[PDB]
Amino acid sequence: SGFRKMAFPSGKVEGCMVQVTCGTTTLNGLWLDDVVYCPRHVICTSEDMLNPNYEDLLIRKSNHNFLVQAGNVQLRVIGHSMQNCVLKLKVDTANPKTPKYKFVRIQPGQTFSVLACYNGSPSGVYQCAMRPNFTIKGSFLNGSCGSVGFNIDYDCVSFCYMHHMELPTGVHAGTDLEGNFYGPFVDRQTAQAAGTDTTITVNVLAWLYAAVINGDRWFLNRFTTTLNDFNLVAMKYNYEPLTQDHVDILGPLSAQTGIAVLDMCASLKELLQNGMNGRTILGSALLEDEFTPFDVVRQCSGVT
Amino acid sequence: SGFRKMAFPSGKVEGCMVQVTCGTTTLNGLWLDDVVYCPRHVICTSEDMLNPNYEDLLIRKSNHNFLVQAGNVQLRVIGHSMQNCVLKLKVDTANPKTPKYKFVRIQPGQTFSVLACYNGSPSGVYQCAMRPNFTIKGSFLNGSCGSVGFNIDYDCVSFCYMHHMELPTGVHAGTDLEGNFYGPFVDRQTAQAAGTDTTITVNVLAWLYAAVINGDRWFLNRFTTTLNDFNLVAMKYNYEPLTQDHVDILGPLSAQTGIAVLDMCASLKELLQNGMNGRTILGSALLEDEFTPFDVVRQCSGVT
Ligand SMILES: *C(=N)[C@H](C[C@@H]1CCNC1=O)NC(=O)[C@H](Cc1ccccc1)NC(=O)[C@@H](NC(=O)OC(C)(C)C)C(C)(C)C
Numbered sequence: 001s002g003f004r005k006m007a008f009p010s011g012k013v014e015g016c017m018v019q020v021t022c023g024t025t026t027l028n029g030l031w032l033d034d035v036v037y038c039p040r041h042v043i044c045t046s047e048d049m050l051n052p053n054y055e056d057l058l059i060r061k062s063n064h065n066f067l068v069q070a071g072n073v074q075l076r077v078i079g080h081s082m083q084n085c086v087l088k089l090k091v092d093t094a095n096p097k098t099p100k101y102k103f104v105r106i107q108p109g110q111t112f113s114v115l116a117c118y119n120g121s122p123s124g125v126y127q128c129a130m131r132p133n134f135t136i137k138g139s140f141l142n143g144s145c146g147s148v149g150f151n152i153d154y155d156c157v158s159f160c161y162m163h164h165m166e167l168p169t170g171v172h173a174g175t176d177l178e179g180n181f182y183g184p185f186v187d188r189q190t191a192q193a194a195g196t197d198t199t200i201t202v203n204v205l206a207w208l209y210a211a212v213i214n215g216d217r218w219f220l221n222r223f224t225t226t227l228n229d230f231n232l233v234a235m236k237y238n239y240e241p242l243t244q245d246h247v248d249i250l251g252p253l254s255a256q257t258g259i260a261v262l263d264m265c266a267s268l269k270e271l272l273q274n275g276m277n278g279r280t281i282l283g284s285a286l287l288e289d290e291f292t293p294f295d296v297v298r299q300c301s302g303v304t
Numbered sequence: 305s306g307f308r309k310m311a312f313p314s315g316k317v318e319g320c321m322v323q324v325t326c327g328t329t330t331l332n333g334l335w336l337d338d339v340v341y342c343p344r345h346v347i348c349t350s351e352d353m354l355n356p357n358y359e360d361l362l363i364r365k366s367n368h369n370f371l372v373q374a375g376n377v378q379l380r381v382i383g384h385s386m387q388n389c390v391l392k393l394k395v396d397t398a399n400p401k402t403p404k405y406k407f408v409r410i411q412p413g414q415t416f417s418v419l420a421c422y423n424g425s426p427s428g429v430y431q432c433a434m435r436p437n438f439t440i441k442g443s444f445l446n447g448s449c450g451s452v453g454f455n456i457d458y459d460c461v462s463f464c465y466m467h468h469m470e471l472p473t474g475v476h477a478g479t480d481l482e483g484n485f486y487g488p489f490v491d492r493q494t495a496q497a498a499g500t501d502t503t504i505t506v507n508v509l510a511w512l513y514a515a516v517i518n519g520d521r522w523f524l525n526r527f528t529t530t531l532n533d534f535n536l537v538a539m540k541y542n543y544e545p546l547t548q549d550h551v552d553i554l555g556p557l558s559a560q561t562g563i564a565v566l567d568m569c570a571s572l573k574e575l576l577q578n579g580m581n582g583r584t585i586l587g588s589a590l591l592e593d594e595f596t597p598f599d600v601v602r603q604c605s606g607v608t
Pocket residue numbers: 027039040041042140141142143144145146163164165166167168172187188189190191192193305
């Protein structure tokens with residue numbers, strides 16, 4: 001038992017990280033087969049981002065303007081192209097540690113692991129959720145761009161995030177591996193900011209189910225609520241309205257525990273209105289919303 | 305910026321995990337050079353732990369009673385011995401992915417990463433602290449024993465924990481890699497339990513310094529306290545008394561931020577007495593005590 005914010009083992013992704021240098025800018029790239037993926041802003045100088053014409057900037061560059069270092073070894077760039085906000089550098093060597101992989105675009109509320117990298121080398125791993133405002137609560141410093149977010153299925157790495165920028169409140173925005181930013185954010189110097197960050201209701205309910213699986217049952221009550229009644233409370237306290245689709249994906253956890261989804265909603269509704277009596281659920285004095293229903297099943301049974 | 309509970313990249317340790325089977329018991333082992341380390345309880349049946357004489361149990365066994373599987377490959381056990389609560393199985397093949405490594409025993413309050421494993425295969429990674437009651441807040445299921453905890457220096461993996469058992473409150477106890485349990489716990493069926501879990505004061509102060517580095521400064525005040533005055537407040541709210549040694553190791557963070565340690569103690573003292581105004585520090589409504597002063601420096605600057 002016990003329940004922790006748990007990341008995927010990073011070894012498969014560690015073998016894909018390389019360093020990309022263009023001019024005086026150094027960041028990380030993702031080396032899969034004979035292609036290296038990295039943020040396109042690597043071609044900007046300190047004073048190119050004010051009004052960056054990425055097309056003109058890249059047209060001015062050639063292959064020898066891009067340096068790729070894999071550990072101690074220089075990889076020779078033999079081609080380059082741009083796809084949305086991602087630069088694609090063709091190299092003369094296929095990565096011998098290329099994993100089976102997919103490029104996926106996730107929905108808000110879904111989770112993934114981040115391998116934070118500097119100088120093309122792994123530094124740390126942590127678990128993130130794509131917030132409803134399309135930011136993530138990362139930990140990133142100078143040189144971290146090109147770090148990736150991912151999930152693992154069996155032996156297949158699903159890459160879903162590449163890091164580009166930090167917003168004024170210390171949260172972060174990036175793209176999928178096709179270069180399309182999550183949310184309305186862009187790799188330009190405009191007055192961008194994270195909006196209000198709503199609590200992911202279906203994730204909180206999943207975490208409450210995790211608590212029941214772990215023997216924490218004090219918050220359950222014998223009186224059911226309605227979806228409309230629960231949502232009335234959910235708009236206050238800044239929770240996402242619970243949809244029928246969200247009720248649906250909580251089904252497997254409801255069947256496993258014997259607690260009807262609307263009974264758990266009644267429990268959550270009571271917790272919001274009366275507050276937690278300085279009390280812990282899974283050892284936390286707060287409701288956690290960065291576990292999906294699939295995350296709970298994986299950690300509680302699927303890992304075995 | 306941003307600050308997250310961050311684990312070390314697990315790839316170096318993933319290559320050391322193997323599966324160990326004895327009788328009907330299957331768990332994980334750590335394969336370094338030509339030795340496999342695993343909990344000695346693997347030699348017990350379901351009804352041997354009531355009064356286990358591990359010496360007699362191991363004397364009855366031979367090499368062919370131990371099966372070690374590294375991925376798809378059986379490793380031949382050619383020797384066996386017991387050191388404290390750890391079994392050491394000599395195999396005929398040295399691990400080709402053996403990292404540079406050390407066996408270390410950590411102090412309470414220090415942190416490490418856990419690679420949770422099942423069937424000798426990595427499942428997830430998360431960050432733990434050795435609690436003052438000598439337990440860790442892990443996430444472990446059946447078959448997880450032999451999962452290890454570690455820190456990484458440069459290229460050297462410092463193994464500090466191997467998982468053995470779960471206590472009634474859903475926390476966990478284990479040994480160092482020499483087989484000596486942390487705390488008063490034993491691999492026997494006695495009425496063991498985690499005691500009161502004290503808050504690691506020096507870690508909370510370190511995290512407050514991390515908040516200042518990240519631009520969170522609202523909790524600072526211009527009035528200093530004394531160590532004795534702070535500790536009077538610290539015994540209430542169940543904080544560890546702050547020692548001069550703890551003040552010492554906060555020195556580098558105090559110099560970096562310009563905030564004297566006793567000024568941060570005054571800030572912490574005010575936070576405990578008046579509570580947090582539903583307010584967030586680093587986006588958390590609570591004080592976090594699972595980051596050491598070295599953890600803060602690593603995440604804020606050292607990773608670059
Ligand atoms: C990439 N290495 C770097 C990562 C950030 C450094 C500080 N924390 C981070 O997460 N990102 C940047 O430097 C980007 C520009 C860039 C560079 C290389 C590749 C891709 C993108 N710039 C910023 O994140 C920037 N934010 C910013 O301008 O925010 C606005 C647009 C004003 C809302 C700064 C954090 C550097 C101020």
